[PDB]
Amino acid sequence: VEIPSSFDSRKKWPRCKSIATIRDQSRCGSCWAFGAVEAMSDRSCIQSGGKQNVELSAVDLLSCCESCGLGCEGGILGPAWDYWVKEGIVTGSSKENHAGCEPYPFPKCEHHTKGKYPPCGSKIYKTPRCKQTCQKKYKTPYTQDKHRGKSSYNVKNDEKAIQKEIMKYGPVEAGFTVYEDFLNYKSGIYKHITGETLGGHAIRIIGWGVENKAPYWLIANSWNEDWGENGYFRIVRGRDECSIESEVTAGRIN
Numbered sequence: 648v649e650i651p652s653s654f655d656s657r658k659k660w661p662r663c664k665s666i667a668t669i670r671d672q673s674r675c676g677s678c679w680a681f682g683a684v685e686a687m688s689d690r691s692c693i694q695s696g697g698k699q700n701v702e703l704s705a706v707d708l709l710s711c712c713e714s715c716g717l718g719c720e721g722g723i724l725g726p727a728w729d730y731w732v733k734e735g736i737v738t739g740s741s742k743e744n745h746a747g748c749e750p751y752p753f754p755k756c757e758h759h760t761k762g763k764y765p766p767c768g769s770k771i772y773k774t775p776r777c778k779q780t781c782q783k784k785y786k787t788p789y790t791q792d793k794h795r796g797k798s799s800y801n802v803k804n805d806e807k808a809i810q811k812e813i814m815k816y817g818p819v820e821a822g823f824t825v826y827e828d829f830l831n832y833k834s835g836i837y838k839h840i841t842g843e844t845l846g847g848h849a850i851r852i853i854g855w856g857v858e859n860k861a862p863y864w865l866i867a868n869s870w871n872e873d874w875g876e877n878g879y880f881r882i883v884r885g886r887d888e889c890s891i892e893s894e895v896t897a898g899r900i901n
């Protein structure tokens with residue numbers, strides 16, 4: 648195929664509402680789980696021609712995947728996709744919308760930025776327990792609300808391979824290194840200038856573009872819609888900026 652200079656998953660597959668949804672992981676180190684259920688929600692819709700149009704549950708993955716790390720303390724990407732393939736994941740929206748089988752138990756909050764929600768602060772919740780029961784008002788049993796994938800894989804550390812993967816199969820999960828200057832991000836194309844490493848983060852790459860010739864990836868963060876560019880940010884593309892091209896994980900439903 649021929650890679651266009653820009654691409655936006657939200658515009659190619661506008662029926663799939665999840666693609667344009669920005670979630671909030673709250674006072675929980677569950678970024679690994681959010682980039683996963685987000686992109687799986689997207690891919691379930693894309694690769695099924697719109698048939699599954701759902702919001703997969705972040706708390707189901709977070710709480711039940713023992714091989715994925717330590718829940719709100721952090722986790723690993725590849726295993727989250729293996730869990731989706733082997734056990735599947737039920738539906739579940741944010742806490743506020745309280746929809747689907749298992750909605751998120753934690754409230755929106757501001758992640759080192761100004762806005763309408765309360766500050767998150769530094770305190771971290773304990774990982775919720777693996778319930779395996781839907782909320783009472785949801786009319787399907789847990790076991791049967793499960794959405795499974797068929798494969799899971801890493802994507803080659805190559806810009807063009809990542810681009811081809813996104814355009815054909817949909818948004819991907821990716822890890823990158825967080826430096827202190829990322830916490831002051833409001834807008835623009837980000838790149839590490841100042842600050843020391845605070846860890847890694849896991850997000851959803853949904854596209855790319857170019858602004859006055861500067862190439863970037865377009866990425867959905869999980870710190871709610873008040874953060875960055877309406878919940879999204881942009882980061883230098885093509886230089887493995889903060890290892891943005893090195894920890895790409897995805898999977899297919901068929």
Ligand SMILES: *C(=[N])C1([N]C(=O)[C]([C]C2=[C][C]=[C]C(Cl)=[C]2)[N]C(=O)[C]SB2345B678B9%10%11B6%12%13B6%14%15B%1272B632B436B94(B%10835)[C+]%11%13%14[C+]4%1562)[C][C]1
Pocket residue numbers: 672675676677678679715716717720721722723724822823824846847848849890894
């Ligand atoms: C979010 N929210 C956070 N982050 C996270 O989780 C991360 C993701 C990633 C991964 C990989 C790479 C990258 Cl760049 C990113 N993670 C982390 O940090 C990890 S934590 B842990 B692991 B091993 B496993 B379990 B898990 B835990 B520790 B050890 B390590 C084991 C234990 C949070 C912030």
